[PDB]
Amino acid sequence: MPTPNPLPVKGAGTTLWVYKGNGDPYANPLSDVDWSRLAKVKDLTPGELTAESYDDSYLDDEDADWTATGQGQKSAGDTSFTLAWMPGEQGQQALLAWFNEGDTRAYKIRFPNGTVDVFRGWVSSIGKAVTAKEVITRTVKVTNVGRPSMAEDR
Amino acid sequence: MPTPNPLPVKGAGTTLWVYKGNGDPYANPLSDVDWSRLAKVKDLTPGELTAESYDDSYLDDEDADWTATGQGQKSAGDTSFTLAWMPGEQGQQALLAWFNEGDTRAYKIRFPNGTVDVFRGWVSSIGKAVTAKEVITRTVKVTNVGRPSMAEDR
Amino acid sequence: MPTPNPLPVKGAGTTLWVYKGNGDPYANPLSDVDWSRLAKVKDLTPGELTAESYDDSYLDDEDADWTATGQGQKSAGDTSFTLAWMPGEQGQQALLAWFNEGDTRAYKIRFPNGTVDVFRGWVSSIGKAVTAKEVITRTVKVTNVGRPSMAEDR
Amino acid sequence: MPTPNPLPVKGAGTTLWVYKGNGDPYANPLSDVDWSRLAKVKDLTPGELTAESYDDSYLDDEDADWTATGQGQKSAGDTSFTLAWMPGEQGQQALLAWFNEGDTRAYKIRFPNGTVDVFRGWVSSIGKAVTAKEVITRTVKVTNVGRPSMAEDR
């Protein structure tokens, strides 16, 4: 039960948070003193940090048999999470205020370990799913603006 | 049974309505005094509110390692619902009058909660499905013209 | 058994017809006095009435946050039906005469209700399927030329 | 058992033939006096007779609400059949002679009815499938050059 960082952990217990609007979100992310919680999370796919290949081959080089490339312009991907549709909840009202405002906010993912994943982004997709025998779900996707504060930066 | 907004709800009981043609559809959407009902709904997929990424990178900036973007020109998606084919019903006759007229009308989705979802759009697709052992179904898709009155605007 | 238009119906009993070549197919479609029948129908997918979105955004407008569009140039889709391969039947001989002539003819779909669906189009695809244990099937697809006489125009 | 053209038939018994090289293949196709047989047919998909839509809308016309098109440049599709790999058979040797020569030959499909399907085309694909527990199969595809002699031209 005591959270081991060196040991693998199950995903059960992951929580989401959104910054309430103070300064310096990346400083002290392990305190929830100013983070609203998005309860009732069904599933969550974090962003995929990709990178564009940059071509590094000249005409003058001698070894033209194998492709030579280098990393360039890394980009944080999209984070997609599905919640239970609760319109009266303050979190979801703040979420669509975020959508209709267009600003980039800082959202945190708190894992069962003593580690957090802080990203800054703007929401780019909001949808719903209505089924007779299932709870109404709200699917949200956020596009990041770069420079994430990964958990292993501590 | 009393409709809790803060609590998650099942999708069973969702209904559809179309504005009969008075003024100000977004004002007082919780009264059905001027909304015709589209009965016998098989399934319903509401619109997906998406947004186009806007590039915000200049040559003069110093941090060119991570992509920086911002929300731009948000768009409401398509709403697709399937009904049971009832040509004599006034609702479906009004629906194909809507299709053959081309105007943009206001349609409402009433959830089992005390909340409504009002959109304005024009129908862009109408089809049928004929099967020996199943009821004839009419599939309809509506493209929205923007500025939806989401349920959490209250 | 008496055909209720206001009530939903099962698809069993749908029939197909082709105009024998008199005038005004859209007038009095509920009489089969001049319509040949295409018997032995396996399955039938009617046309999908779609529409192209027309852009309505100017530079001068103030609200450039949400996409504004309008319906434009509606088009009837393709109708695809599969019959049992009967080369000696007059209907299928007339069907390939239709294919090899290129003219646009009026075909009717008669539902179990007291309603009909009349379209005008030209056949654009004719194929076969040969299997050891199944009857030989002839698949036909017709592209419409517009202005269908839907059932709810009565 | 006596072959009824007006009645539907099962696909079992379909055979393939290739013209040995006399004149006028379309004349008298119901005699096998000069047609070699391709025995051991696993499956066979005949050609799909498609047609390209030709645009018929002018600026001067009044009805610009519905798309108006017309048939144009009909094309016979590809016929794909799989045989059992028998290199010593005269039929398959003639088939790869056909492939390596490039000429367009006339091949006939004889259905269990008293009807035949004669096409003229050139083979465009020849492959194999090697599996431990299955017979080696040779898959062949032929592209047609147009004007097929369908069975219902009699």
Next chain:
Amino acid sequence: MPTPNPLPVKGAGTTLWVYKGNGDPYANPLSDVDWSRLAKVKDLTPGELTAESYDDSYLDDEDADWTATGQGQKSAGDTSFTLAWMPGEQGQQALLAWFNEGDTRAYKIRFPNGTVDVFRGWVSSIGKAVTAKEVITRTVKVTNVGRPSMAEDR
């Protein structure tokens, strides 16, 4: 058991070989006096001999209703086989020598019949698959340079 060419055969027993580097690979392919063997073959998909359609329609022709084409620039496809990963085997060392040299070599497929399939090509893909409970597999794909010596040329 005696290999019948006119009769269909099962695929079990197919073997692969690579030319050791003498002259005239297409002459006498039924002798393994100078062919190294690639043992432990899991599966093998031979090349697909395709052909590009060449347009033969002029403006002057009278029959412009059906597409007329002709075979042009036939091409042998890719041959893809998977072996068991045996780095110490001389065959696989020769195979990656082939890959890192770039030359086009002649490889033979020996079927359970008394027939062989000789192709000339260069390897264009080499990969691996590591699974806990399965043997490590090496997948290889070879692109041919044309003019195969099919088995029925005898």
Next chain:
Amino acid sequence: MPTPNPLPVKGAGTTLWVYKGNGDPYANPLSDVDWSRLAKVKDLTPGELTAESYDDSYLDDEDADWTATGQGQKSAGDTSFTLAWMPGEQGQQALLAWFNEGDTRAYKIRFPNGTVDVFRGWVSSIGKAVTAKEVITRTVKVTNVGRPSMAEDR
């Protein structure tokens, strides 16, 4: 149990390593004196060594019936491995240091045999998967810069 190179082996026991930063990674790859280990590997797909086809057909040649090509500009593919998410592990911290630095490092795959696979590349993708009943997984993909030291170069 004694590792046979000539004999096929199961994939169980494959390990991953990253160079700690000395010189000449390709020299003596069978010693782990300066290689950090990436423990808890779920699955691993090594790179696929592909090659681009180079056209070798001139107008002057006589044989224009079959495509003639030759190997050109071979490229090592992407290597994708999934680990158990252990942020406190030195290996994963070094891995995201690698990602945020952009340099190309040498990573080794040690098979159950006495053979190693050394590649040089830069990481281009890092993602996560959060599930309630499964361990949190970190998926990593590395793009190679060419000239791999395959196991059969010994």
